[PDB]
Design a protein around this ligand. Sequence first.
Ligand SMILES: [Cl-]
Length: 262
Amino acid sequence: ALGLLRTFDAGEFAGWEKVGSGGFGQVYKVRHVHWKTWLAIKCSPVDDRERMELLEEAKKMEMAKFRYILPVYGICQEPVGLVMEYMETGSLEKLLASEPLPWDLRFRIVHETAVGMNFLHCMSPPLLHLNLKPANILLDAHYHVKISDFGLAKCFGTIAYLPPERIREKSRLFDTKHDVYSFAIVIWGVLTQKKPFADEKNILHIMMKVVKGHRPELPPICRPRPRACASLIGLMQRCWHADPQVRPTFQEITSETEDLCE
Ligand SMILES: [Cl-]
């Protein structure tokens, strides 16, 4: 698991350039000078708890090596950091804010995301992502999906992606149905090109309502692809069902999202 990962010196990198920040904080586009390609490095903002947690993150990424999962290359220690593949086009969040997207691409993004999530849940034991949102869905130069940010995975803003049972229950056992809910809200974002609950300012009221079955407002049926759109809306609704056990598996989800790409 941790054997094939490489150790990097900062001298191996150059042309450092910030691409995103926050809690994890400081992600940079870097050029590996000897390999002549760009990589991504997420740095720290010191102790042994971070070093072991960062190493855990890398090992989880490595175990899930897949077409729709971001590759990990290894560890820097000049600044302590996770070294991984660079995704030129950046996040789905930015893509949805940029301009209206063609529906064929929207369905492909949904489908590829679902195939990525399915892969994780097919592992033994299942790997739960638990932080799936457009901001963590990265896109390559040809707009194909690779799932990213395994910081919260297990063997403000995030409230919208939180399943209602996580609000109902103090300290519930994390399961596959968590990810399925979050995926529902990803679908909603792809359908609308909006962020969920972006206008409503009362976070607590809207969270309370979510425990009792309140969800983001259903979008209308689009003109270009009204049948596929209806189907996707329906799938979304099943994925955000109040009862976790009624929600589809990603095995079922992928069967349906595949048909949307026809
Ligand atoms: Cl259609």
